[PDB]
Amino acid sequence: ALKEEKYAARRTILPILQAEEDERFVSEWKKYLEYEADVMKDVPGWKVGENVYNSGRWMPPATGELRPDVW
Amino acid sequence: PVMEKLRMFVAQEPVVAASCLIGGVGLFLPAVVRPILDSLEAS
Amino acid sequence: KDWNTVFERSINTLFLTEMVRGLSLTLKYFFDPKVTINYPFEKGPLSPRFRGEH
Amino acid sequence: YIAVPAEILGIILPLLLGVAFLVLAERKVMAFVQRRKGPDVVGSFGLLQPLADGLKLILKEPISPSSANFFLFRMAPVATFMLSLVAWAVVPFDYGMVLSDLNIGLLYLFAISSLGVYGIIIAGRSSNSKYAFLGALRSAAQMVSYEVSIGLILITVLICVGSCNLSEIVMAQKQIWFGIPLFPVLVMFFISCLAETNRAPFDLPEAEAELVAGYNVEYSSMGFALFFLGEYANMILMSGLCTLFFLGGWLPILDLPIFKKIPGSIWFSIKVLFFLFLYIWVRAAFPRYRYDQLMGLGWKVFLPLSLAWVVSVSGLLVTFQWLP
Amino acid sequence: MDLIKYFTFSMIIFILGIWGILLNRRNILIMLMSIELMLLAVNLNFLVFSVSLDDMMGQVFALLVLTVAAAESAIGLAIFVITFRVRGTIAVEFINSIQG
Amino acid sequence: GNPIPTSAVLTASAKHIGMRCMPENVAFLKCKKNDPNPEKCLDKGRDVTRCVLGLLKDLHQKCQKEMDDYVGCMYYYTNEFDLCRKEQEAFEKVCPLK
Amino acid sequence: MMLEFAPIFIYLVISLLVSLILLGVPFLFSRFDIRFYLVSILFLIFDLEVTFFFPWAVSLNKIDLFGFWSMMAFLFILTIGFLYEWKRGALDWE
Amino acid sequence: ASGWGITGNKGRCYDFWMDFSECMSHCREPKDCTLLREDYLECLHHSKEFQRRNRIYKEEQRKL
Amino acid sequence: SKAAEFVISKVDDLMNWARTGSIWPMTFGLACCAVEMMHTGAARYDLDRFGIIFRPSPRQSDCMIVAGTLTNKMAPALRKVYDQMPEPRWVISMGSCANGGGYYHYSYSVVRGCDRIVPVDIYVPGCPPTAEALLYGLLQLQKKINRRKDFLHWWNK
Amino acid sequence: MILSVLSSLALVSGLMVVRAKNPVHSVLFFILVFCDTSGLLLLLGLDFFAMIFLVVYIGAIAVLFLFVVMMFHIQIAEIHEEVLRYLPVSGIIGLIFWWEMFFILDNESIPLLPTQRNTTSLRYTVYAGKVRSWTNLETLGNLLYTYYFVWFLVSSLILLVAMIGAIVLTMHRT
Amino acid sequence: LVWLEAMLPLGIIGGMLCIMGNSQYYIHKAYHGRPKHIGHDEWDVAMERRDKKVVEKA
Ligand SMILES: C[C@@H]1CC[C@@]2(OC1)O[C@H]1C[C@H]3[C@@H]4CC=C5C[C@@H](OCCC(CO[C@H]6O[C@H](CO)[C@@H](O[C@H]7O[C@H](CO)[C@@H](O)[C@H](O)[C@H]7O)[C@H](O)[C@H]6O)CO[C@H]6O[C@H](CO)[C@@H](O[C@H]7O[C@H](CO)[C@@H](O)[C@H](O)[C@H]7O)[C@H](O)[C@H]6O)CC[C@]5(C)[C@H]4CC[C@]3(C)[C@H]1[C@@H]2C
Ligand SMILES: C[C@@H]1CC[C@@]2(OC1)O[C@H]1C[C@H]3[C@@H]4CC=C5C[C@@H](OCCC(CO[C@H]6O[C@H](CO)[C@@H](O[C@H]7O[C@H](CO)[C@@H](O)[C@H](O)[C@H]7O)[C@H](O)[C@H]6O)CO[C@H]6O[C@H](CO)[C@@H](O[C@H]7O[C@H](CO)[C@@H](O)[C@H](O)[C@H]7O)[C@H](O)[C@H]6O)CC[C@]5(C)[C@H]4CC[C@]3(C)[C@H]1[C@@H]2C
Ligand SMILES: CCCCCCCCCCCCCCCCCC(=O)O[C@@H](COC(=O)CCCCCCCCCCCCCCC)COP(=O)(O)OC[C@H](O)CO
Ligand SMILES: CCCCCCCCCCCCCCCCCCCC(=O)O[C@H](COC(=O)CCCCCCCCCCCCCC)COP(=O)(O)OCCN
Ligand code: SF4
Helix, strand or coil: CHHHHHHHHHHHCHHHHHHHHHHHHHHHHHHHHHHHHHHCCCCCCCCCCCCCCCCCCCCCCCCCCCCHHHC | CCCCHHHHHHHHCHHHHHHHHHHHHHHHHHHHHHHHHHHHHHC | CCHHHHHHHHHHHHHCHHHHHHHHHHHHHHHCCCCCCCCCCCCCCCCCCCCCCC | CCCHHHHHHHHHHHHHHHHHHHHHHHHHHHHHHCCCCCCCCCCHHHCCHHHHHHHHHHCCCCCCCCCCCHHHHHHHHHHHHHHHHHHHHHCCCECCECCCCCCCHHHHHHHHHHHCHHHHHHHHHHCCCHHHHHHHHHHHHHHHHHHHHHHHHHHHHHHHHCCCCHHHHHHCCCCCCCCCCCHHHHHHHHHHHHHHCCCCCCCHHHCHHHCCCCCCCCCCHHHHHHHHHHHHHHHHHHHHHHHHHHCCCCCCCCCCHHHHCCCHHHHHHHHHHHHHHHHHHHHHHCCCCCHHHHHHHHHHHHHHHHHHHHHHHHHHHHHHCCCC | CHHHHHHHHHHHHHHHHHHHHHHCCCCHHHHHHHHHHHHHHHHHHHHHHHHHCCCCHHHHHHHHHHHHHHHHHHHHHHHHHHHHHHHCCCCHHHCCCCCC | CCCCCCHHHHHHHHHHHHHHCHHHHHHHHHHHHHCCCHHHHHHHHHHHHHHHHHHHHHHHHHCHHHHHHHHHHHHHCCCCHHHHHHHHHHHHHHCCCC | CCCCHHHHHHHHHHHHHHHHHHHHHHHCCCCCCHHHHHHHHHHHHHHHHHHHHHHHHHHHHHHHHHHHHHHHHHHHHHHHHHHHHHHHCCCCCC | CCCECCCCCECCCHHHHHHHHHHHCCCCCHHHHHHHHHHHHHHHHCHHHHHHHHHHHHHHHHCC | CCCHHHHHHHHHHHHHHHHHHCCCEEEEECCCHHHHHHHHHCCCCCHHHHCCCCCCCHHHCCEEEEECCCECCCHHHHHHHHHCCCCCCEEEEEHHHHHHCHHHCCCCCECCCHHHCCCCCEEECCCCCCHHHHHHHHHHHHHHHCCCCHHHHHHHC | CHHHHHHHHHHHHHHHHHHCCCHHHHHHHHHHHHHHHHHHHHHCCCHHHHHHHHHHHHHHHHHHHHHHHHHHCCCHHHCCCCCHHHHHHHHHHHHHHHHHHCCHHHHHCCCCCCCCCCHHHHCCCCHHHHCCCCCHHHHHHHHHCCCCHHHHHHHHHHHHHHHHHHHHHHCCCC | CCCHHHHHHHHHHHHHHHHHHHHHHHHHHHHHCCCCCCCCCHHHHHHHHHHHHHHHCC
16 A cells, blocks of 8 residues: 555656656757758758658657666 | 374374475465355355 | 374474473573683682692 | 765674674673683673784784695685675665665575585685595585575565565564564574574584584685684674564564664664574584484475475465465 | 677677587587587577567576576586496597497 | 745645646546657646646645645655655645645 | 666675785685585576576566466476485485 | 567567558568568667668768 | 884784784693693683683694693604694693603603604693693793784894 | 676686686686676666576586586596697687677667767656566566466476486485 | 673674664765665656756756
8 A cells, every 4th residue: 555655646746747858858859850950961862850660650769778777 | 094104104204294284275275265265255 | 103192293393392491501501600710810729738849 | 976985884894893793792602601701801801802813813824735726725715705795785774774775685695695605615625635625515515405495485585575675575574573473484594594604503614523624624814714704794694684584674573652762773783683692592502413414404304394385375375365 | 889799798608608619629528518608698698689679588588598508507417427437537538439 | 936846846745736637637648648759749748737836836825834844854755655644744734635 | 777786896896805905914924426416406406496486476466376376386396306306315415 | 579578568669560460460462561560670670760870970970 | 213113012012912812722632631621621710711712723723732641653743733833833731741751751652742843832730730720821821922022023134 | 898898707707618727717717707697687687687697507507517527526638638729710610600690780780879969868758667667577477477387387397307317317325 | 690791792793783774874864965765766766867957957
């Protein structure tokens, strides 16, 4: 019961934390897209922020670190 | 006449007999008592 | 021989009953006074017949 | 992280002092049972005896016999001493009083225990002495044999708790100390701890008078002291583990405000002291088994009983749905 | 670069096992040890892939492979022991009588 | 004025938040379930954030002292409810969950 | 999280240093017994038994009756092996 | 492909896997499921993503 | 050097205190004198209380007590055990037999004093010396150890 | 860098496994290799496997190897041989394996070149999976005994075979 | 009452254990500003990292 109390507490404040994180990531992604537009200016055939997945479904950017979340 | 053979086994191997009884209780409870408790809960 | 005596033997073997008495009377001497002599301030007893240095 | 070394030293140095005084306490209690005094000249009430013995040891010339395993011979005591030290990183003394709050702490302790055998084996083999080698082999076999029962008892506690975190194991005993329902398991654990630390009535390396040479017979000066210190630190650790698993660690005896006044570290210390006293008392009370007898006890008595307790506890908790 | 570095670690362990087979023609105990090294490298390969792919199958199989490694070493060392007992030596010239 | 919405403040107020911002929370979670893309969920996030910050300001206005003590203890014990029962009761007696 | 393992490493380094200091300051002023192999084999088997017990013990609340009986079958096989060893005299050191 | 994630949730690439499998379960020619298959493999290895980002880094190193 | 000598003497006092407070004899229990030695270690006199702990291996020993008659057959064994003792080390000769051959002096099989085989620091007279006499001899050994100035002699060498 | 350190330690320790003249020394170096492997496992976040590698590989398997090798008392004459004449055959076989097998992942798993820009801000955090995190231990235990229990039991059969074989091949009852 | 001599070394051991607990507890508290929290999981770490921003950027 003690654990469920803590876990319910985490559940009620989840949406606001997620919304904050979403706003942060969107702003950072816009900045990175402007950066890529500048760097790849004068490279023909480019498309800024092209989705590499054919389905077009959204995935977070891959990081190239095997297990970053545990450290 | 296997009723003092078990007596003799218990007298000579108390540790093995105790281990068998303890583990047998641990096996008997989920095998028999748990389905009974599950059945009484359904009704 | 009998279920009661076999049970009593099994319990005594499993519960180390006879090991308890040794622990108890070792513990009894723990609180009693000690026999050690505080040499050289205190000495052991000797008799007028003691054969020491010529 | 800059303050981490200070915490580590605040663990290691008082532990070494505690070992030095555990040796003195063993001598004192043994003497008092034997109606004598034990150390009482070197310092008041003999309280300076450990410092004098340590000073003597460091001022003793090392021997290092002309063996072909010069490196291994000196590294074996280092290995056993370091292993005795590092188990304390995960030991909690009170709520939040622990260096490493490992989620896998129980298995980590099991791993350290399993590693302890190598110092003894390497000391026996590297010493270039058939007696030391044979004694080391026998001691190693005894330790691995009783490690099985220790692991199974660990599993019994784990089934009750549902987490390998030592602090969680302590806090799971707020309702009742595990030593009450699992009292035979606690007795089994204490005996297995005696055998695992090569302590009486299982102290083969101490049986020189029985034509059984110990694994450290060729050692002098500080290698021998390292072996001794590791052994006594492991005794303190086994007492601490008995306290954590079955006597509720830092918890008070009764959940009452009168008992909650005194800090949890003091509760933990008092329980550890009780178990150390039992170590000494047992050494004072009984003769020792032969090697073959204790091996038979390890494999024929404690393993079957430990496995049976695992089965019984798990079956009972599953049946009535009392699992964590 | 993480995944290439984790994979080359296990890869050097595997190549070391292969080299130990190649370099130990008079020492079959080390040949057994080299085979364990290869098995350890494969086990590491399963664990790394499990993390990289976010999949548990690599972890289940790693545990089972550890069981196989243990049984393999037990039986192999028994066979080594009985070979030594029969011959009184472990030299390779005393285990070459079956040929042709 | 407006309390800094740190982990301590949010965790201490979590029960009030769950009782008060339930519709916004559920709507946000449904939209996240349908689409994990953060851009396609910003509106529901703003609704959630406004509800939560309004409730935070309200609770600060009603019981300032009890809220301060409860938040302070929660931060001191890293949001461990068990070590904070007294001030939790004091906070809930003056700022009822309703 | 693996954060808690870092103090263990620093602790190991410090313990090693203490060991070297203590050990280094005084430098300033053909009979094969098969029963050991057999006890090693038994320890290996029951070591793996404990290994497999750990996840089971922490997972009992989720695996329920099926997991309990599967582990029981595992133990039944291993205990038949143990009975075989017991009868054959592998556990006797006399 | 299994769906069991290493942290106790659905695996990262399992929805891609299931789309690919469901496509192949009724398309008599595997070339009709090529796009979903390469999406699954891209989720496993991120090859095209990292290649494109390396192109960006390359152009940055060229223009500096 | 008005400051170096004081620190040196303090160091030597610390070394002597450590070495007198922890004397770990190995017993060469040869004959009747070993029984009185056992009594010295027993409860009435309690050599433990002086820090004296008896060791089984010469490797962990600082002192050898020769308690009893030394025969010609045994002499090589005594010398080899003495040669395994790490420095610093001392030898106590206990009883007339070990001191000078005693009642067996004129025998064809007896070493006429263990000081023909090993250097002796203290001679404890008696046949056997009482347990208290052995304790007095051990206190004389402490007195001899307390004249050592190892650090000072090495500083000047 | 840290993986460079651990890989270098593993490389040297493994060479010592395969090249030490004394087999007891080989067993000890093998133990160093397993310690380094455990370090890598801790880097991957697999603490259960990191501990189990110590318990089983070092605590049980290496102990078995050490007991057997120590009681063998192998003389170096029985297993000595010069290895200078193997350098070429190891060179081709190693190179071919090196060129093929250290780089097999490169075409499938192309590394991300680390740039002079902070990509850490593009890490997206999903708090939903963080409400109730599972340990490596409980994630494995959720699967071993229910969904894949047959493989578990077959492994038990393998261990039973090991026990029977150990008895039948070596037992000499007094 | 002579047996009280033996209780002094045991009391010293107990005090040593109390030190190994409390000294490491107070050093951690002084450095981090609050006592160590048992059971720090992914959620708590994410909370602390986000709280650094929510505090410093205010
Ligand atoms: C019982 C017996 C006794 C014996 C025994 O057991 C048995 O005892 C056992 C005891 C064991 C030791 C226990 C413990 C460790 C520590 C571990 O070492 C941690 C290393 C990890 C953690 O390191 C950092 O982790 C976080 C950063 O990641 C830090 O967080 C910050 O950053 C956060 C984010 O901004 C902020 O939010 C936070 O606020 C902020 O604080 C955190 O502080 C810090 O710890 C991994 O880190 C690396 O990994 C990176 C990824 O690969 C590498 O990145 C690089 O490559 C990238 C491209 O790939 C490029 O993009 C990058 O630019 C480029 O740098 C890079 O090399 C490096 O970072 C190494 C293993 C070892 C020694 C064990 C050995 C084996 C034993 C001796 C066992 C032994 C067997
Ligand atoms: C031979 C020689 C002789 C001499 C010698 O050596 C040997 O002899 C040796 C013998 C040694 C003494 C032994 C013991 C102590 C006690 C210790 O003092 C208590 C430890 C502190 C923390 O630990 C507690 O707290 C834990 C958490 O609650 C308890 O856990 C609970 O909860 C768990 C979970 O539910 C359950 O599982 C547990 O069962 C349950 O108990 C844990 O048990 C308990 O110990 C006391 O804390 C307090 O101090 C705080 C300061 O900040 C104050 O905080 C306050 O102020 C904040 C700011 O505003 C606000 O935010 C806060 O809200 C607000 O509270 C406040 O006063 C109060 O908290 C002080 C050190 C001393 C004297 C040692 C000195 C040195 C020696 C004399 C040695 C000496 C050298
Ligand atoms: C040292 C102890 C030895 C113990 C030996 C005795 C027990 C050995 C195991 C024998 C098999 C089970 C016997 C127990 C009968 C009671 C089974 C029972 O109660 O039924 C449960 C189901 O029990 C089982 O089905 C488990 C069977 C265990 C598997 C035993 C193996 C049998 C053959 C397997 C074939 C695979 C090939 C073998 C490979 C070697 C009902 O559970 P549920 O359907 O309501 O929900 C499932 C669960 O609660 C949620 O996860
Ligand atoms: C608050 C105080 C807490 C104290 C905690 C620690 C307690 C003190 C522990 C130390 C006690 C003294 C230790 C020295 C004795 C060591 C020698 C042990 C020898 C031994 O194990 O003998 C075996 C029986 O004991 C055993 O088997 C031991 C295990 C007993 C477990 C009991 C198992 C069944 C219990 C009944 C449970 C039923 C209820 C649940 C359903 C049988 O071997 P043998 O060869 O000596 O045979 C001869 C029998 N005369
Ligand atoms: S001196 Fe006397 S008491 Fe001592 S051994 Fe010789 S005869 Fe026996």
